[PDB]
Ligand binder design. Structure first.
Ligand SMILES: CCNc1cc(C(=O)N[C@@H](Cc2ccccc2)[C@H](O)CN[C@H]2CCCc3ccccc32)cc(N2CCCCS2(=O)=O)c1
Ligand SMILES: CCNc1cc(C(=O)N[C@@H](Cc2ccccc2)[C@H](O)CN[C@H]2CCCc3ccccc32)cc(N2CCCCS2(=O)=O)c1
Length: 373
C-alpha cells in the first residue's frame, strides 16, 4: 500500500502525503535526501494552497527557538516546535517529531507544485540550527520498530514510491549494487570514473568529488564541479555534433525544441557514473540516457513542439546526483549498513535501442582514493 505514494511535477520535486498535529492536518511534503530539516508552511503565502495551523493542534509544543535554512535554491525561516506526525500511505505509525513552522520564505515555495513542506531525510550532522535537532527519520526509527532504511523509486505530472523500512522487490529488476556512504551528513558517496558516449573523461577521480558527491532527491539536476562540467559539455557536444545548439542551451538558459514526436534521442550520448564499490578498487556503473538529462518542459504555448531544458549544470558545492539521475533507478538508502543501493527500476528509462543500466563489477589498477578530503 506504499507503492505509488509519491506525486510531483517535473523540475519541482516529488512529494508524499503526511499529517501533522492532532486532529491531523494533511499536507503534501517534498521528499529531500539532500537536507535534514522537516519544515512546513505555517503562514499564508501566494503559492500555498494550505498550511500548518499550530493553534488548531492540541498536541503542538513550541520549542521557543527560531531557525533559518538556506538551500541552493530558496530559503526560509520559521519557529521550531514538535507535534505528532503520520504518513497515511507509509508505515502506519505516529511519531512526535521536530517541525519547523515556516513563517517567511524566499524563492522556496513553487507556484503550482502542490506541496507545502519539505522532509529532510539526511543526517543530524547538517540539521539547523545544529545536530541536536533530531531529524524526522531518526525519530521514526527510535519511536517505532521500523528498520533503519528507506528506498526511493522516482519515475519520470510525475510519480513514484517511497518505501520505508524495507525493500520492495516488485519495484526493480536485476541486481542491487551498493556504494558506501562515506560520511553520514549528506548521503555522501564517491564517484571513481565518468564516461560519456563510452569515452573516459580521464580526470584524476578526486575531481569528480570536489568537494563532495551526494545523492539528492531534492535537487533536480546532475550538478558537476566546474572542471568536470566543462569536460562533460564538450563531450556531449562532440557526440551530438550533427546538430548545433546555442551556448545558452548548455547553460540552462534556453530550451531546445523539436517538432512534436521527432526528438533525435539517438544523437545524444549515454553517461556512465562509476560509483565506489564495497570492495577495494571495485566499482559499478549507473548509465543515464538523454531522456533523463534532457528534462521536458511542459507548456501549452510551445506544444506544437517538444521542448527540453539541459539538466546538467555547474556547482561549486560538489557533485549532486539529483532527481534526473535517480529517475528510473530504485535507490536504497540503507542507513543501517551505511550504504546506498542502486538497481534498474520498474519505471526505468529505455527506448528500442538503449536502456538505463546498473552494471558491475569493474576493477581499477590505480590505488588512489577518490575522496577529495
Ligand atoms: C525541486 C526544485 N529545484 C531545485 C532545488 C534545488 C535545491 O536546492 N534543493 C534542496 C531542496 C529544495 C529547495 C527548494 C525547493 C524544493 C526543494 C536540497 O535540499 C539541496 N540539497 C543540498 C545540495 C548541495 C548544496 C546544499 C546546500 C544547502 C542545503 C542543501 C544542499 C536545487 C536546484 N538546482 C539549482 C537551480 C538550477 C537547477 S538545479 O541545479 O537542479 C533545483
Ligand atoms: C543498437 C544500439 N545499441 C546501443 C548503443 C549505445 C550507444 O550509445 N552507442 C555509442 C557508443 C558507446 C556508448 C557507451 C558505451 C560503448 C559505446 C554510439 O555513439 C552510438 N551513437 C548513435 C549512432 C547513430 C545510430 C544510433 C542508434 C541508437 C543509439 C545511438 C546511436 C549504448 C548501448 N548500451 C550501452 C551499455 C548501457 C546500456 S545502453 O546504453 O543501452 C546500446
Amino acid at each position: 500500500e506504499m507503492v505509488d505514494n509519491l506525486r510531483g511535477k517535473s523540475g519541482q520535486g516529488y512529494y508524499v502525503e503526511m499529517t501533522v498535529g492532532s486532529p491531523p492536518q494533511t499536507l503534501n511534503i517534498l521528499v529531500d535526501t539532500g537536507s535534514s530539516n522537516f519544515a512546513v508552511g505555517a503562514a499564508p503565502h501566494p503559492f500555498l494552497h494550505r498550511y500548518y495551523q499550530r493553534q488548531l493542534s492540541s498536541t503542538y509544543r513550541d520549542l521557543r527557538k527560531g531557525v533559518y535554512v538556506p538551500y541552493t535554491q530558496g530559503k526560509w525561516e520559521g519557529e521550531l516546535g514538535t507535534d505528532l506526525v503520520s504518513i497515511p500511505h507509509g508505515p502506519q505509525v505516529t511519531v512526535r517529531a521536530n517541525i519547523a513552522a515556516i513563517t517567511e520564505s524566499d524563492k522556496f515555495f513553487i507556484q503550482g507544485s502542490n506541496w507545502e513542506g519539505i522532509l529532510g531525510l539526511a543526517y543530524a550532522e547538517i540539521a539547523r540550527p545544529d545536530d541536536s535537532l533530531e531529524p524526522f527519520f531518526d525519530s521514526l526509527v527510535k519511536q517505532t520498530h521500523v528498520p533503519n532504511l528507506f528506498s526511493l523509486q522516482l519515475c519520470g505530472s510525475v510519480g513514484g514510491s517511497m518505501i520505508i523500512g524495507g525493500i520492495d522487490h516488485s519495484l526493480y529488476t536485476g541486481s542491487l549494487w551498493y556504494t558506501p556512504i562515506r560520511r553520514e551528513w549528506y548521503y555522501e558517496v564517491i564517484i571513481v570514473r565518468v564516461e560519456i558516449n563510452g569515452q573516459d573523461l580521464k580526470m584524476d577521480c578526486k575531481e569528480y568529488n570536489y568537494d563532495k558527491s551526494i545523492v539528492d532527491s531534492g535537487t533536480t539536476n546532475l550538478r558537476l564541479p566546474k572542471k568536470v562540467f566543462e569536460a562533460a559539455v564538450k563531450s556531449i557536444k562532440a557526440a551530438s555534433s550533427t546538430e548545433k545548439f546555442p551556448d545558452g542551451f548548455w547553460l540552462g538558459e534556453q530550451l531546445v525544441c523539436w517538432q512534436a514526436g521527432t526528438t533525435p534521442w539517438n544523437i545524444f550520448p549515454v553517461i556512465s557514473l562509476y560509483l565506489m564499490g564495497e570492495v577495494t578498487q571495485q566499482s559499478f556503473r549507473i548509465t543515464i540516457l538523454p531522456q533523463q538529462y534532457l528534462r521536458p518542459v511542459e507548456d501549452v504555448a510551445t506544444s506544437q513542439d517538444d521542448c527540453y531544458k539541459f539538466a546538467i549544470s555547474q556547482s561549486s558545492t560538489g557533485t549532486v546526483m539529483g532527481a534526473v539521475i535517480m529517475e528510473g533507478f530504485y535507490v536504497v538508502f540503507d542507513r543501517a549498513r551505511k550504504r546506498i543501493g542502486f538497481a534498474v527500476s520498474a519505471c526505468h528509462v529505455h527506448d528500442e535501442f538503449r536502456t538505463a543500466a546498473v552494471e558491475g563489477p569493474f576493477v581499477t589498477l590505480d590505488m588512489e582514493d577518490c575522496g577529495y578530503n
